[PDB]
């Protein structure tokens, strides 16, 4: 299922962030400066929770949700995950294009996580500023992919 | 005869202490000391036959102003007199022995000792060593960069027991307090 791709994405993200942790340690990665990319299509923080902790209602369609576990908030969860991944992939392609065009080789964005995002996409629908922006984007994407792994593991298993 | 060589000093950041060495027989002696200053106001502390007194910040004693100390011991119907000392107590600091377990490593005819200490100043380390058949031998260790400190000692064909201490020092090289007591003994085989 999509769970294996999700674990592969987690492993690749962990590998590339651990490499960036010494390669860009002096810029901002050493404080943490937790800022993310989206605040308004960020429905994942309110919908991507198991249907045992939803006490109150105050908190595309997808094609990888199993039919043994069909719900109403889960489709919104998967759609919001898709939209968040769309924003993340667009920003990562833009920053990769802006990063190869200069003469500094002190950072590499390996394509393993990019193709991992791409297959997760296809399964789910049928100067100096750039490197510190990359650091903060990674610091948000780590928690994002952990949340995605949690909800998809709950949904599948 | 009588109390002599009074020394009030600061054991820790929040605690202070005072000690004196008494000469003569001990049959019915009672040791009390008088603390005088200008707020005169001569408070007194009692400790019985013991020869050390412990207090701290909030005991109503001045630690930032000039303070006079003296001692009255007891003998029946007669008293014994002591000298007067006039000093401040905050910046006359007695430091601590080396912190916890120290690390000892052996090289060619040499022993290197390392530890971690919570003082950033360079304390003149003076150590002493003793093979368990004879008495002790003393020696200065040497300056070091200061966090962590290092000490060196020549080896011995038999085992030995070695102790080590510190004292606080100002930037002028002046002695900034009394000698700290020795740490726990360190045993090393040949």
């Amino acid at each position: 299922r999509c769970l294996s791709q999700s674990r592969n994405l987690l492993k690749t993200t962990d590998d590339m962030v651990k490499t960036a942790r010494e390669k860009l340690k002096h810029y901002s990665c050493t404080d943490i400066d937790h800022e993310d990319i989206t605040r308004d299509q960020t429905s994942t923080l309110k919908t991507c929770l198991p249907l045992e902790l939803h006490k109150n209602e105050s908190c595309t369609r997808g094609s990888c949700l199993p039919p043994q576990k069909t719900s109403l908030m889960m489709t919104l969860c998967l759609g919001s995950i898709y939209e968040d991944l769309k924003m993340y992939q667009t920003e990562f392609q833009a920053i990769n294009a802006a990063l190869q065009n200069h003469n500094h080789q002190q950072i590499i964005l390996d394509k393993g996580m990019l193709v991992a995002i791409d297959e997760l996409m296809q399964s789910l629908n049928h100067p100096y500023r750039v490197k510190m922006k990359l650091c903060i984007l990674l610091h948000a994407f780590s928690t994002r992919v952990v949340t995605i792994n949690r909800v998809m593991g709950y949904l599948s298993s | 005869l009588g109390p002599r060589n009074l020394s009030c000093y600061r054991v820790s950041k929040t605690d202070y202490e005072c000690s004196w060495q008494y000469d003569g027989p001990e049959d019915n002696v009672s040791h009390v000391l008088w603390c005088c200053f200008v707020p005169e106001r001569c408070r007194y502390f009692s400790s019985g036959p013991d020869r050390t007194v412990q207090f701290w910040e909030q005991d109503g004693i001045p630690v930032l102003s000039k303070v006079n100390f003296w001692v009255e011991s007891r003998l029946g119907n007669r008293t014994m007199k002591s000298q007067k000392i006039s000093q401040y107590l905050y910046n006359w600091t007695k430091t601590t022995p080396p912190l916890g377990h120290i690390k000892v490593s052996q090289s060619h005819r040499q022993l290197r000792m390392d530890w971690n200490v919570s003082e950033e100043a360079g304390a003149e380390v003076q150590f002493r060593r003793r093979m368990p058949t004879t008495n002790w031998t003393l020696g200065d260790c040497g300056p070091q960069v200061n966090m962590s400190e290092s000490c060196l000692c020549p080896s011995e064909n038999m085992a030995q027991e070695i102790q080590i201490r510190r004292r606080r020092r100002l930037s002028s090289g002046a002695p900034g307090g009394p000698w700290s007591d020795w740490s726990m003994p360190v045993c090393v085989p040949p």
């Binding site: 939803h54 908190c59 949690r150 593991g153 | 401040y88 912190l99």
Partner: protein, 293 residues
Amino acid sequence: MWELEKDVYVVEVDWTPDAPGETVNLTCDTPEEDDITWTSDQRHGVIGSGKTLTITVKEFLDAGQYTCHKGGETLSHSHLLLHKKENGIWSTEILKNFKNKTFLKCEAPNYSGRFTCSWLVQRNMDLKFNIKSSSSSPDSRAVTCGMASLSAEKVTLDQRDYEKYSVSCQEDVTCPTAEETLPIELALEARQQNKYENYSTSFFIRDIIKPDPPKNLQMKPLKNSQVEVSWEYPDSWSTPHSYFSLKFFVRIQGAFLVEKTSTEVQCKGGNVCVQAQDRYYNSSCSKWACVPC
């Protein structure tokens, strides 16, 4: 110089011997034509005249209880604490740092929103602690901390006993979220009978998780000198276990991790043991549970 509570003021006194202290104007809160006398607990005799008194605070002798008296009665009382400042760095002497050079150690057993914050005092006379959520924004996450209580687990540091205080806190939200964004920030107001110290900390509830040991560790014999070690998820861990997952560590008495609740390995003739840890983050490991070979 600020008002901690009603008729309780605290001043910032530099702990340099030659440096001068601060000037405090204290006024009894009831007007009378008769001159108002002032008394202190750290000093004897009448110290002030009139309804307003000026105090040159320099040391702990010039602090404590100040009372305004008229005739043969009192009118009001006002306390006065100190806050030591040394070389520009505020003192930290009531509490003792842990092994990792931190003062407040907070730990949570699961993702339920409740945790326990503990510290190590140095002396045990007249301590009045207070822990509260130091808010700095209208959207800051708020906790409702309880009363601090003594714990009988006297820890050993510097080969020396240190007595331990603990408090239980619980974060409350309108409806729970999927992840944590703004960290919990906490402030502690420690005081020792005249001395005031302020401590602070900030953490997430995901990097302080310390799970519980497995509850039913047993053992099945199998063929050719190879055995089976089975365990169970702790009952205090958050539910369901498919969404909150764990990775277990197994060591025979260097260890290998298992993601399933059952493993097979040959024994050496000693007690085999498992521990639990959160699968995703590098949270603190659990205490081991064991079963004899």
